Design a binder for this molecule. Sequence first.
Ligand SMILES: COc1ccc(CN[C@@H](C(=O)N[C@H](C(=O)NCc2ccc(OC)cc2O)C(C)C)[C@H](O)[C@H](Cc2ccccc2)NC(=O)[C@@H](NC(=O)OCc2ccccc2)C(C)(C)C)cc1
Lengths: 99, 99
Amino acid sequence: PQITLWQRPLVTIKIGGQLKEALLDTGADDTVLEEMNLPGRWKPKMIGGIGGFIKVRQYDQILIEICGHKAIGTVLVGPTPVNIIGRNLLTQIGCTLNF
Amino acid sequence: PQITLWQRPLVTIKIGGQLKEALLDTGADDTVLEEMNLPGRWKPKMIGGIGGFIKVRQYDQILIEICGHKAIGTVLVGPTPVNIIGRNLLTQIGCTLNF
Ligand SMILES: COc1ccc(CN[C@@H](C(=O)N[C@H](C(=O)NCc2ccc(OC)cc2O)C(C)C)[C@H](O)[C@H](Cc2ccccc2)NC(=O)[C@@H](NC(=O)OCc2ccccc2)C(C)(C)C)cc1
């Protein structure tokens, strides 16, 4: 779809049997989601944004149905205000920035 | 231009006689520029991001030439680690997301 940016670019995802709503973020190198129940092994990791750093659980190799498109990658779960899809999955679903 | 997301979507801007590089960010509602010399009257403000809030100064109707395209908006200067062009200027230069 073509998304124009007058409103936040939100899109529905299905992760872990679960229906979520996430923000399509080109200035996010990483995918970070609010605390949720996810099956598996996780590593601790820390990431920065403006304001500073949060600790997150890097889950590796999680399938995500991003707007009907399946992708598999590293998903970080942690105490974010909004669910963020970062360029590690945006390149998977073929997303480009156009102006 | 069409920009893919294999690397950070960086672009050159010219703000106030100064040449800089900024991150074209759909997940940013606002444009926050690293500390710099802007002429003007600013108001304080606090913006939020993932690791907390920071205090930034709001300077309104600042011309920015983003990749040769001119736009005039509200720019916040403050302690960001990266310069960020957010959806308040991205919609101005005609930027859309596509997949
Ligand atoms: C509601 O709050 C939100 C809304 C969205 C987010 C998601 N992130 C964005 C971001 O912070 N957006 C800000 C925003 O729109 N916030 C809404 C907002 C809320 C309240 C408000 O009050 C008036 C004003 C506002 O504008 C703008 C201002 C930068 C940007 O996409 C933001 C831009 C940036 C880039 C690099 C370094 C620092 C900042 N991106 C990041 O924070 C991303 N950071 C980044 O990619 O580096 C990651 C990393 C570091 C170290 C080791 C491993 C990885 C990431 C953490 C999401 C992956 C977080 C919180």
